[PDB]
Amino acid sequence: GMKSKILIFGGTGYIGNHMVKGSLKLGHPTYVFTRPNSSKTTLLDEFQSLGAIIVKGELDEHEKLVELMKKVDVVISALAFPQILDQFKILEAIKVAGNIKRFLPSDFGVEEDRINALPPFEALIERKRMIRRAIEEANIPYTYVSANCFASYFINYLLRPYDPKDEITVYGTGEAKFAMNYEQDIGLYTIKVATDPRALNRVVIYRPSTNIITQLELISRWEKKIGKKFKKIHVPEEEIVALTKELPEPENIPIAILHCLFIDGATMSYDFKENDVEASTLYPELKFTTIDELLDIFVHDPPPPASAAF
């Protein structure tokens, strides 16, 4: 009915599929633009069975993009790091169409306009800033989402719950704080703020108070949940830093990200600004799945590990 029509790019991606599912769950007409040569045919069918309108094509099809933009109201991009600047193709279509009410570029991580990282990762977030600068210069309505750490992804990466090993790797001292949110919630809240006036032309950060922790505390809580103790093996910062200088690309990128998130503590190294919007405060009918609840999920029905593209 009055629900805004949502167009999603990168819908078959790691975080993108949660935005597609969240959009549909919220009753929004959902358009999913995806490549003709899809290896995610089983994910697309699911989207379709849920009500999504699948649109096959390439980002290079400018005319197709423009005609598509004219049919929707909101555009959300969840493209991967290798395609950050390709979002300029999406932006060009938005500019020509002229009817888009809100554009959310592919951020969904650290708040790049207030943090810096090691060269490997800095080059990537600088590309994300370029997109933001282009959006602002064109006066395109937007929302910049800083979703912080993807919880299932990093619980898998840090705790390796599927690994019966007796040791656990700690990056740096392990004392740096970070915030991590459940992917399903990131998807749901993202759709909500994309149509929320309180988020128009603002930076929205997902930092629920129940999802802030350090590597050491996460380990301790996991140990209590499963009744096992692990031998902690640390990886010195100077060591991680060196690797980002010697290892090739994209190898050194994950290492740079690990330093940013778990050593520098970039997701918790700042205080909120006047115009910042912290998402957990927006909806009294919803709440972010907490860290304890997340650990319970991994104990009862843990999700498969994943690896972002670089």
In angstroms, the Cα distances linking 223 to 62, 64, 176 are: 52, 52, 19
Instruction: State how far the Cα of 167 lies from the Cα of 159, in Å rounded to an integer.
Output: 10
Instruction: State how far the Cα of 273 lies from the Cα of 288, in Å rounded to an integer.
Output: 21
Q: Which technique?
A: X-ray
Helix (H, G, I), strand (E, B) or coil at 287: coil
Instruction: State how far the Cα of 97 lies from the Cα of 66, in Å rounded to an integer.
Output: 6
Amino acid at 25: K
Residue ranges of the annotated binding site for NADP(+) are 12-15, 34-40, 81-83, 106-108, 128, 148-150
Instruction: State how far the Cα of 242 lies from the Cα of 271, in Å rounded to an integer.
Output: 30
Same fold across 1-146+183-205+271-283 and 147-182+206-270+284-310: no
Q: Which two tokens stand for residue 144?
A: 């910049």
Q: Which two tokens stand for residue 206?
A: 């997902």
What is the domain partition of the chain in residue ranges? 1-146+183-205+271-283, 147-182+206-270+284-310
Instruction: State how far the Cα of 180 lies from the Cα of 155, in Å rounded to an integer.
Output: 9
Amino acid at 43: L
Amino acid at 9: F
Question: Which residues are registered as beta bridge partners of 167?
Answer: 231
DSSP string for 18-45: HHHHHHHHTT--EEEEE-SS-S-HHHHH
Catalytic residues: 128
Cis bond upstream, residue 105 (ω within 30)? no
Q: Give the orientation angle of helix 16-25 with respect to helix 183-194, to 10 degrees.
A: 60
In angstroms, the Cα distances linking 138 to 87, 91, 197, 204, 263 are: 14, 10, 20, 20, 36
Quick one: DSSP state of residue 290? P
For 1-146+183-205+271-283, which CATH superfamily applies? NAD(P)-binding Rossmann-like Domain (3.40.50.720)
Q: What resolution in Å is listed for this PDB structure?
A: 1.8
Fold for the domain defined by 147-182+206-270+284-310? UDP-galactose 4-epimerase; domain 1 (3.90.25)
Q: Are strands 102-104 and 74-77 parallel, antiparallel or unpaired?
A: parallel
Nearest to 31 by CA among 61, 9, 46: 9
Q: For 215-239, b where at least 16 C-beta lie within 10 A, e where not — what string?
A: beebbeebeeeeeeebeeeebebee
Nearest to 203 by CA among 129, 300, 296: 129
The pair phi, psi for residue 6, each rounded to 5°, is: -110, 130
Residue ranges of the annotated binding site for substrate are 110, 254
Residue ranges of the annotated binding site are 12-15, 34-40, 81-83, 106-108, 110, 128, 148-150, 254
In angstroms, the Cα distances linking 79 to 114, 138, 215 are: 22, 21, 28
Question: Which residues are registered as beta bridge partners of 150?
Answer: 181
Quick one: DSSP state of residue 99? -
Q: Are strands 212-214 and 177-181 parallel, antiparallel or unpaired?
A: antiparallel
Question: Which residues are registered as beta bridge partners of 33?
Answer: 9, 55
Q: Which two tokens stand for residue 210?
A: 């129940």
CA angle 25, 31, 32 (to 5 degrees): 100
Neighbours of 259 (CB within 10 A): 24
